[PDB]
Amino acid sequence: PVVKINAIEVPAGAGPELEKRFAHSAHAVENSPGFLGFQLLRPVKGEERYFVVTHWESDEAFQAWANGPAIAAHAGHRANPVATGASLLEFEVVLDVGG
Amino acid sequence: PVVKINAIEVPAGAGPELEKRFAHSAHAVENSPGFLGFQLLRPVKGEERYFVVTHWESDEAFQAWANGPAIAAHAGHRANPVATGASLLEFEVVLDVGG
Numbered sequence: 001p002v003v004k005i006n007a008i009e010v011p012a013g014a015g016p017e018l019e020k021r022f023a024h025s026a027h028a029v030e031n032s033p034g035f036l037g038f039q040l041l042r043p044v045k046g047e048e049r050y051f052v053v054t055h056w057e058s059d060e061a062f063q064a065w066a067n068g069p070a071i072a073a074h075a076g077h078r079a080n081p082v083a084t085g086a087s088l089l090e091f092e093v094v095l096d097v098g099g
Numbered sequence: 100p101v102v103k104i105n106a107i108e109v110p111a112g113a114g115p116e117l118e119k120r121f122a123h124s125a126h127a128v129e130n131s132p133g134f135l136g137f138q139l140l141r142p143v144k145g146e147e148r149y150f151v152v153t154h155w156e157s158d159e160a161f162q163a164w165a166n167g168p169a170i171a172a173h174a175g176h177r178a179n180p181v182a183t184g185a186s187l188l189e190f191e192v193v194l195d196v197g198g
């Protein structure tokens with residue numbers, strides 16, 4: 001599997017607004033083929049960016065979602081972001097250990 | 100829950116040695132109270148550091164592990180580190196969505 005993290009820069013005080021924009025977003029991705037899950041991570045120490053951490057069975061599965069269903073999920077939405085920058089961090093899972 | 104990511108810097112070519120070291124490390128953290136799991140992420144694009152992504156029911160559970168077992172787990176090892184630096188990134192899980 002692969003991990004794709006969108007590391008989002010958020011202006012001071014805009015944390016709650018950004019989090020609210022994610023609150024009903026599950027429908028936009030949860031059903032996608034090869035999707036294994038995602039977490040929105042609020043930074044607490046050592047990082048100022050929010051991490052949107054997504055897990056996929058493959059790179060192609062993420063790309064299919066990004067190029068199709070993800071774009072479609074914007075219909076009817078303002079495209080005015082509160083984030084001031086974003087960086088995509090891509091990784092391959094080399095080890096996974098359960099609780 | 101909380102997420103603690105250790106972002107470790109690894110010289111070129113040490114990736115395999117670092118990964119081999121993590122391959123036999125599950126025992127050092129699994130079963131610890133409040134531990135929910137971890138992944139070793141090998142960087143592919145956008146990042147040069149390995150991400151050690153760990154999940155915990157609370158910060159206290161993470162501190163209890165880091166302060167006791169994790170230290171104890173070094174006893175008997177005679178290898179020098181291959182990592183040259185590390186940064187702990189700490190997060191609160193705000194949203195969790197399963198696939």
Ligand code: HEM
Nearest residue numbers: 004006021022025028029038054081082083084085086088
């Ligand atoms: C992991 C791959 C992803 C990438 C590359 C990506 C990419 C982006 C980019 C480039 C932006 C614009 C941010 C800016 O203006 O600086 C954005 C915003 C956004 N994305 Fe993601 N995204 C990803 C995953 C997700 C997922 C899984 C969700 C939710 C299901 C999501 C929901 C959002 C939302 C709600 C915004 C609006 C942020 C705002 O208004 O400031 N994204 N994304």
Ligand code: HEM
Nearest residue numbers: 021024025028029065066070073074077078079080081082
């Ligand atoms: C320049 C590029 C982008 C911009 C400016 C942008 C902007 C936004 C904004 C402002 C929203 C908020 C909608 C609202 O508040 O109602 C949103 C939602 C979202 N974005 Fe984007 N985004 C971009 C690219 C991306 C990409 C590349 C991805 C994933 C690969 C993504 C995934 C999402 C998702 C899943 C949502 C939530 C849709 C929903 O609430 O139903 N976005 N985006």
Ligand code: HEM
Nearest residue numbers: 120123124125127164165169170172173176178179180181
């Ligand atoms: C400067 C500080 C540290 C140094 C120089 C260091 C060095 C090392 C080295 C060389 C190993 C090799 C084990 C092997 O090759 O088999 C190791 C293992 C390990 N380290 Fe550290 N470490 C440090 C701090 C930490 C911290 C702060 C944690 C967690 C809170 C940690 C957790 C671990 C764990 C869980 C193992 C694996 C134990 C095992 O597989 O038996 N280390 N460390």
Ligand code: HEM
Nearest residue numbers: 103105120121124125127128153180181182183184185187
């Ligand atoms: C998330 C909290 C963690 C922290 C704060 C932490 C911290 C550290 C630090 C400071 C080092 C020394 C890096 C250096 O010498 O530059 C290290 C090395 C290491 N840690 Fe972690 N660690 C964490 C989690 C873990 C876990 C869960 C494992 C495995 C179960 C692990 C296994 C190791 C190993 C094998 C090394 C040696 C890397 C090498 O060979 O150079 N650590 N850790």
Ligand SMILES: [Cl-]
Nearest residue numbers: 006007008052
């Ligand atoms: Cl995002």
Ligand SMILES: [Cl-]
Nearest residue numbers: 105107151185
């Ligand atoms: Cl580590």
